[PDB]
From a paper:
Residing in the ER membrane, PGAP1 removes the inositol-linked acyl chain from nascent triacylated GPI-APs (dubbed GPI-AP3) to form the diacylated forms (GPI-AP2). In our quest to find stable proteins suitable for biochemical and structural studies, we identified PGAP1 from Chaetomium thermophilum (cPGAP1), which shares 20.7%/29.1% sequence identity and 33.8%/45.7% similarity with the human/yeast deacylase, respectively. Due to its higher model completeness (81% of its 1183 residues), the cPGAP1S327A structure is used here for structural description. cPGAP1 contains a transmembrane domain (TMD), a lipase domain with a typical α-β-α hydrolase architecture, and a third domain with two jelly-roll subdomains that show a classic β-sandwich fold.
To obtain the cPGAP1 structure in a lipid environment, we purified the full-length cPGAP1 with a C-terminal TGP fusion in detergents and reconstituted it into lipid nanodiscs made of the membrane scaffold protein (MSP) 1E3 (average diameter of 12 nm)50 and 1-palmitoyl-2-oleoyl-phosphatidylserine (POPS). cPGAP1 co-eluted with MSP with a monodisperse and symmetric peak on gel filtration, indicating successful reconstitution. Using single-particle cryo-electron microscopy (cryo-EM), we determined the structure of cPGAP1 at a nominal resolution of 2.83-Å (cPGAP1apo). Superposing cPGAP1H433N onto cPGAPapo positions the PLM carboxylic acid close to the catalytic Ser327, which forms the catalytic triad with the nearby His443 and Asp407. The three structures are overall similar, with a Cα RMSD (root-mean-square deviation) of 0.04 Å between the two product-bound structures and 0.38 Å between cPGAP1apo and the liganded structures.
Author numbering: 139 to 576, 604 to 873, 895 to 955, 980 to 1062, 1069 to 1094, 1102 to 1150
């Protein structure tokens, strides 16, 4: 007799190391390598007007959903549309009220700044009208039908909206303005998936949507694979986007005038891996980009799932970008696609990305410099301009630096960096940088890169108190080949009183300023990297480590002091960590120590298609005072504990199905021991025996399968075919031996607790004092979602397990120990399909509040086995070798299938365990 409670020293240590690593991964993911939170709360006056003219006549889903139009209180006094239509699709468990901050800032900007502008009104800027959908806090990620129903409802609403702009009592707008044929769709979370689904739906108007701006939307892969329909919808929307853009002829492309910008909140986003927000595999760079929120200028901060919609810093950047893509003189109320893309690139991207277009070199001359005929400001070639303060000469004066000749073999770059705002043409301010050919001068202001302000008192690139926001530094950068036509670069001081300021401008050879360190990941993970930048270094220097591409490894960056002899630094050192492929850039103001966590190659997303030739891996860009005549040292080491929590977000769904592979192997061992020796061993005796051979060999075979134009290559197993991460198979295997052991002990404790309560109550009433199985089966077969029928079965198998345990304690017979063991093993298998089947219960219950074959074949095999155990029968021991073989093969196939296809096709695991349960029913029927 072995108590069901006993554990072997080998299986306890293996189980505790697994529970110990799951507590380390979770802790190091909540505490280590965490980004700073610079999000500032947004304050607004909210009002929503229900558009109830839309009804069951326009869609049968109108009884279920509603459409509301945001009206900011004090700026909006009628439910009348005067501007361009914008729809916010809320995400999973999201409200229509989450549109509160974005709509409010758009209302307050037109009221305070734009209505007064006559050029902006003339060119076609009108207010934006923000419509929002109440999806009754539906959970789209777990029910595929709900996502499709929402897309159909919104395609109708886009038709009903555009119809309110043709109506005089609900429209108040000018009459030369074409009637709107497009709505701008902003989707948070799964609302960016509902937005793309609409374009593939049968009820979609041809040119209804042109611009989709999604916040934290998982475009690459489904967050959860519990629902099959979600897995197929993604395969249809993802395929539609990739086949459309594959088309050579733009006429064939149905998505030519469409633009998708996928914004992501980065690390602080725990609900959706920001790696799944990447559109690189679906949209060409011409038609969209994925930008993290750390690269966005005027934000420079990672945001949590909800913070993306409620930040004050982010609410300002999206409303400014939208009011620069809108034209009421065009049917679709938007600028053409290539213009829409440049506006999104200037407002959301840094400017140092290589997709940006500098327009000022070839821009027409804007100024007439005649005060440079006198030869007083021209300076020596190779002479770097440094203006420690401005206007010490008491007059508007100039400092003119010659553009070197095009004969340069190396690449050479002009870089200017001034804290002071450069002036735009037609304005007067302290500084004006212009490329002047001899006389004709083009202001370079349109091309200014705003960098966070690194000053000795700065800790963060973002400030959560608006009063303390250090005005951003201006930066200019230009490859010489582009600026060669112009002869000089003139920094004109227009200041006339001594004033705080700094302009350091210099032309640097690319070699001297650019460094690449080629060290293997294995060498960098053992020795780190140290790089001394020489004292005679260009103001901007750029180290690139091509090896660091993974999102699973985190490093620490320690930059040396840069103490200056004599005078102090004009600015503190600024580091920009960045990746080319997913537009994730990070800025460390006044760098000393920095945590390098990057969103690079990611476990299960489509393969990165950039195949960039030289720009790959991680690069840090360092800006320091170049007049300090002192060297700086750069150190990059690996963070072992912080890198382990990087695993928690990427594999926070492999515990739905990988813990099933362990159960199948243990059950297989139990069944083969039973058939050979006639004793059905306990789940803990099955783990010790299985952990000695079958769990190790099957973990070695899954590693072998990994090492053995298709965008679904990374969907199986651990998601990566890189030989470096094969260690993830044992970490995912040993965390499961621990979770699959605890669950065994929890089930045993639950059985014991229920037994003692039934005893206590029997004591309570004793001293002081078949039909149900048939009814439940009838109810379970008839009229309920099969997922609830599975949950009641699991409750009837707990009843059999309690009635088996009590008989086993009272008799202590060999065969009564056989049944308690077998029922526990079957109940333990069933408890592991609940993770995949429990979510459809939540949707059914909450959608029934609003009054809203497969249903039989899927639960009957399990309804029969739970009933053939309420009769006390033990599986007949198992033509004999062939029968025991089928049992084994069927339980080994389940283990292998649950490891390979359980992250992407987890829903199928319910229908594989059904097959096994039917096999058990047939084996029961044999004897
Ligand atoms: C032995 C087998 C297992 C036992 C039975 C099964 C128990 C659990 C099974 C799993 C399936 C059901 C639960 C699914 C999780 C739902 C997550 C969720 O809805 O929540 C997000 C976000 O919440 C999270 O990130 C979850 C973190 C805690 C997870 C705890 C899970 C429990 C696991 C431990 C179980 C231990 C069991 C051992 C034995 C008992 C909120 O979306 P939100 O940000 O609001 O809206 C988006 C946004 N505003 C927008 O607008 O779009
Ligand atoms: C194999 C390698 C990869 C797999 C291993 C790990 C994958 C995960 C596997 C399974 C999922 C585990 C279920 C949920 C865990 C994660 C919860 C979590 O991280 O969600 C926090 C909340 O975290 C907590 O508050 C801790 C509680 C977690 C569970 C602790 C017990 C675990 C029980 C396990 C059983 C042990 C029993 C053994 C007995 C000895 C929400 O994001 P939060 O940080 O609060 O946001 C703050 C904000 N955004 C911010 O900016 O900082
Ligand atoms: C249910 C929750 C608390 C999950 C955590 C489970 C384990 C981490 C702990 C709690 C239950 C414990 C077990 C409960 C009962 C037993 C059997 C007990 O001895 C027996 O009754 C069997 C006879 C024998 O040991 O030879 C020895 C300790 C042990 C293995 C305990 C070892 C430590 C265990 C596995
Ligand atoms: C501990 C043992 C018994 C098993 C572990 C349970 C897992 C099945 C749970 C634990 C953590 C859960 C995850 C925690 C949070 C999320 C985010 C959330 O993602 C969504 O699909 C909705 C978010 C959105 O897209 O808006 C809900 C599913 C998911 C992946 C959960 C799926 C189910 C998981 C993997
Ligand atoms: C919410 C989670 C933690 C589940 C725990 C609650 C249920 C699973 C409980 C509620 C009622 C219980 C049932 C109430 C009565 C019985 C009869 C009992 O057997 C008898 O009829 C008496 C004979 C005997 O106990 O020896 C076996 C357990 C069972 C099915 C119980 C199994 C556990 C049940 C379903």
């Amino acid at each position: 007799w072995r108590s069901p409670w006993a554990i072997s020293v080998f299986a306890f240590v293996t189980s505790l190391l697994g529970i110990g690593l799951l507590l380390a991964v979770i802790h190091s993911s909540v505490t280590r390598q965490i980004d700073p939170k610079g999000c500032r709360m947004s304050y607004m006056r909210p009002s929503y007007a229900k558009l109830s003219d839309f009804d069951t006549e326009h869609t049968r889903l109108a009884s279920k959903y509603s459409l509301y139009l945001y009206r900011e209180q004090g700026i909006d006094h009628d439910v009348k549309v005067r501007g361009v239509p914008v729809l916010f699709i809320p995400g999973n468990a999201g409200s229509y009220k989450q549109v509160r901050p974005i709509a409010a800032e758009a209302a307050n900007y037109f009221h305070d700044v734009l209505q007064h502008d006559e050029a902006a009104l003339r060119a076609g800027v009108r207010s934006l009208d923000f419509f929002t959908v109440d999806f009754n806090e539906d959970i789209t990620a777990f029910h595929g039908q709900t996502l499709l129903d929402q897309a159909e409802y919104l395609n109708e609403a886009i038709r009903y909206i555009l119809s309110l702009y043709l109506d005089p009592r609900v429209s108040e707008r000018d009459p030369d303005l074409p009637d709107p044929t497009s709505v701008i769709v902003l989707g948070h979370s799964m609302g960016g998936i509902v937005a793309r689904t609409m374009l593939i739906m049968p009820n979609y108007q041809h040119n209804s949507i042109n611009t989709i701006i999604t916040m934290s939307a998982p475009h690459a892969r489904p967050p959860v694979s519990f629902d099959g329909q979600i897995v197929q919808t993604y395969k249809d929307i993802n395929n539609y986007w990739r086949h459309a853009y594959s088309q050579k002829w733009a006429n064939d492309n149905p998505l030519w005038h469409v633009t998708l910008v996928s914004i992501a909140g980065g690390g602080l986003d725990t609900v959706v891996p920001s790696d799944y927000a990447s559109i690189e595999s679906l949209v060409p760079d011409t038609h969209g980009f994925t930008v993290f929120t750390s690269t966005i200028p005027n934000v420079w901060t990672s945001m949590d799932h909800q913070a993306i919609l409620w930040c004050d810093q982010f609410r300002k950047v999206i409303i400014r970008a939208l009011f620069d893509i809108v034209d009421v003189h065009r049917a679709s109320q938007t600028k053409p696609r290539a213009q829409r893309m440049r506006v999104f690139k200037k407002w959301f991207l840094s400017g140092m990305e290589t997709v940006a277009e500098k327009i000022a070199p070839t821009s027409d001359p804007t100024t007439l410099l005649i005060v440079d005929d006198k030869s007083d400001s021209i300076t020596a070639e190779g002479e770097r301009l440094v203006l420690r303060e401005l206007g010490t000469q008491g007059s508007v004066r100039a400092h003119l630096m010659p553009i070197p000749p095009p004969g340069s073999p190396e690449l050479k770059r002009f870089t200017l960096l001034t804290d002071t705002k450069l002036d735009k043409p037609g304005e007067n301010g302290k500084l004006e940088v212009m490329f002047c050919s001899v006389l004709a001068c083009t202001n370079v202001a349109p091309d200014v890169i705003t960098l966070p302000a690194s000053t000795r008192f700065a800790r963060f690139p973002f400030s959560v108190r608006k009063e303390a926001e250090i005005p951003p530094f201006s930066y200019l950068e230009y490859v010489l080949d582009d600026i060669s036509e112009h002869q000089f670069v003139a920094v004109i001081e227009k200041a006339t009183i001594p004033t705080p300021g700094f302009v350091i401008a210099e032309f640097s050879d690319h070699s001297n300023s650019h460094h690449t360190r080629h060290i293997g990941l294995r060498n960098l993970l053992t020795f780190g990297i140290s790089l001394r930048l020489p004292s005679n270094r260009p103001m901007m220097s750029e180290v690139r480590i091509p090896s660091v591409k993974s999102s699973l490894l985190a490093y620490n960056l320690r930059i040396s002091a840069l103490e200056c002899s004599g005078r102090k630094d004009l600015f503190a050192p600024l580091v920009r960590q960045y990746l080319a492929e997913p537009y994730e850039s990070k800025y460390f103001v006044n760098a000393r120590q920095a945590a390098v966590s990057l969103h690079g190659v990611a476990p299960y997303v489509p393969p990165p298609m950039s195949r960039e030739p030289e720009a790959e891996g991680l690069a840090f860009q360092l800006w320091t005072d170049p007049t300090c005549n002192s060297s700086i040292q750069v150190d990059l080491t690996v963070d072992v504990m912080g890198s382990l929590g990087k695993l928690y977000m990427r594999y926070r769904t492999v515990f739905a199905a990988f813990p099933l592979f362990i159960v199948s192997l243990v059950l297989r061992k139990q069944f083969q021991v039973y058939d050979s020796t006639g004793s059905f061993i306990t789940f803990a005796e099955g783990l010790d025996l299985s952990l000695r051979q079958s769990i190790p060999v099957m973990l070695i075979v899954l590693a072998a399968l990994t090492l053995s134009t298709n965008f679904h290559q990374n969907d199986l197993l651990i998601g990566t075919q890189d030989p470096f991460f094969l260690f993830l198979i044992p970490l995912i295997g040993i965390i499961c031996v621990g979770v699959c052991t605890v669950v065994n002990y929890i089930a045993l404790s639950l059985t014991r607790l229920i037994s003692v309560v039934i005893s206590f109550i029997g004591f309570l009433t004793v001293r002081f004092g078949m039909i149900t199985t048939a009814v439940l089966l009838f109810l379970v077969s008839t009229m309920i979602p099969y997922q609830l029928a599975y949950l009641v079965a699991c409750l009837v198998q707990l009843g059999t397990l309690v009635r088996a345990q009590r008989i086993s304690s009272e008799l202590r017979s060999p065969a009564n120990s056989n049944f308690h063991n077998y029922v526990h093993s079957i109940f333990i298998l069933m408890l592991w399909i609940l993770p995949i089947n429990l979510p459809t219960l939540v949707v059914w219950m909450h959608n029934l509040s609003v009054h809203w074959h497969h249903n039989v074949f899927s639960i009957m095999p399990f309804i029969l086995l739970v009933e053939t155990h309420t009769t006390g029968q033990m599986i007949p021991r198992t033509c004999c070798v062939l029968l025991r073989h089928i049992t084994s093969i069927l339980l080994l196939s389940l283990a292998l299938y649950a490891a390979v296809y359980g992250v992407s096709y987890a829903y199928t695991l319910h229908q594989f365990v059904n097959l096994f349960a039917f096999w058990l029913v047939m084996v029961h029927s044999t004897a």
